[PDB]
């Protein structure tokens, strides 16, 4: 009966183990996949055990976000709690026909594809008014239908773009702070945009940008709708997350090396070669040896 040597995390023997949301989307962080940054729209396989490896998930490209304005960093850790996850295949609303007059869908050089030097997250549509509609608007209301299947939870991603005084006036017809509200599952949250004086770009595509993006998700339970009320600069949802079942999550690390009987929060991958262990009674997952006082 010895205290295990700490070791790397591993694949759980009888159980699919999720490290990154999308293995095969290299050049991508989890949060890049959760947002649908271009080059990060790939298969997100099911697993029944998942390792939580980023307490503060990070983007690494696309348009600069003001992360701390919403609960957005936590999206991929929410996702990893479900057994099954997928970006929807069809857009959840038609962006161009949305309330607020005709829109062109904006794109950015911070978001290169492979067909384009210019693009945007697949979860959202940057709703830019056509040039004859650009002016202040009264709050617009759009309903976001459910669109997932079986008992899937639907996570709906949306936001709003803001800029400095002059830029706001070109893009939209209004240099005033714009207002926004989301409501879904009984949860309501209000936002008001900011004009100029933005913090430094971080975790983004690395092209200089005058503006900033704010991004949120709302949870829609099966059958249930969501509502966005909005003015100028809105990012309307498009591809949404569909999510079902449950995965056990454990704090740990990557890469997952080889296979282990058990995953231990302090000792990492742990085979049940011996029946007991001593030391730190952390949280464990799988077929595990029994903890004992030294």
């Amino acid at each position: 009966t010895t205290t295990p040597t700490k070791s790397y995390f591993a694949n759980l023997k009888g159980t699919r183990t999720r490290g990154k949301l999308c293995p095969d989307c290299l050049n991508c962080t989890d949060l890049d996949v959760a947002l649908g940054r271009p080059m990060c729209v790939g298969t997100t396989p099911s697993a029944k055990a998942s390792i939580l490896h980023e307490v503060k998930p990070v983007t690494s490209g696309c348009f600069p976000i003001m992360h701390d304005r919403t609960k957005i960093r936590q999206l991929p850790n929410l996702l990893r709690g479900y057994e099954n996850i997928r970006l929807s295949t069809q857009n959840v609303i038609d962006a161009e026909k949305a309330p607020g007059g005709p829109y062109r869908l904006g794109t950015s050089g911070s978001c290169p594809n492979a067909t384009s030097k210019s693009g945007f997250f697949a979860t959202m549509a940057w709703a830019v008014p056509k040039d004859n509609n650009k002016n202040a608007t009264n709050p617009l209301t759009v309903e976001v239908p459910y669109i997932c299947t079986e008992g899937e939870d639907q996570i709906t991603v949306w936001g709003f773009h803001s800029d400095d005084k002059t830029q706001m006036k070109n893009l939209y017809g209004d240099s005033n702070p714009q207002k926004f509200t989301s409501s879904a599952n009984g949860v309501t949250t209000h936002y008001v945009s900011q004009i100029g004086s933005f913090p430094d770009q971080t975790e983004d595509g690395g092209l200089p940008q005058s503006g900033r993006i704010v991004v949120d998700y709302m949870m829609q339970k099966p059958g249930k709708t969501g509502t966005i009320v909005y003015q100028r600069g809105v990012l309307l949802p498009q591809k949404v997350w569909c999510a079902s079942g449950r995965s056990k999550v454990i704090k740990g690390s990557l890469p997952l090396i080889g296979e282990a009987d058990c995953l231990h929060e302090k000792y990492g991958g742990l085979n049940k070669s011996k029946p007991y262990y001593t030391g730190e009674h952390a949280k464990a997952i799988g077929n595990c040896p029994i903890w004992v006082k030294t």
Partner: antibody
Amino acid sequence: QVQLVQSGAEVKKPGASVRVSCRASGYIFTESGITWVRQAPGQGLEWMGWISGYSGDTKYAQKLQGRVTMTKDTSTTTAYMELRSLRYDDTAVYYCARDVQYSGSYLGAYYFDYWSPGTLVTVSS
Amino acid sequence: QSVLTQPPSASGTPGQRVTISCSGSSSNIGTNYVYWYQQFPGTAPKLLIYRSYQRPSGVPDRFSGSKSGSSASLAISGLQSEDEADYYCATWDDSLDGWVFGGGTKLTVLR
């Protein structure tokens, strides 16, 4: 073939800073990390810190927090180490090394593999 | 003053088996994996032993890793002229929140 190639030898007055470059080849950079280790002339090895090629997460040696910064660039699969406020004790060879760990808390459960040839930094007035 | 204690010198006539010790504490060698690196003058160190007992590919079975409590040891058997180098042990230290290196032992095969 796993390769690491560093920037050229440097010489600096005390008080200035150095940025050393480390370009990576032959493996999936975004699923590994870089550590840096330095070696004063005719002495032992001192661990400096690590940075993830997946997230840019860093952890530095306690003695060098404040003075050191590590960054990395997925595009060029290159990592950089910046050391500020150089004193004569900073004269050393700077190695980078491929580190197997790329996410989770950095806690030495993994290890570092291949070492680059080494870049010498001479702090002299 | 190194956290891990390595003798500065180890030696043996060619063909003999020499050992290099490495002495630590509970926070490092006691709870963590040991690693060994070999350095020839003016070259990068190379990974020789990993996770206390393993051999990277290329490393002959002549090299052997050992660990007991808060001390580890490197054994070089069938000693040969090309093993003249410096040998460093390394482990993580939970008390100092970073990797630690032994002072390095110089291996001389006496001639």
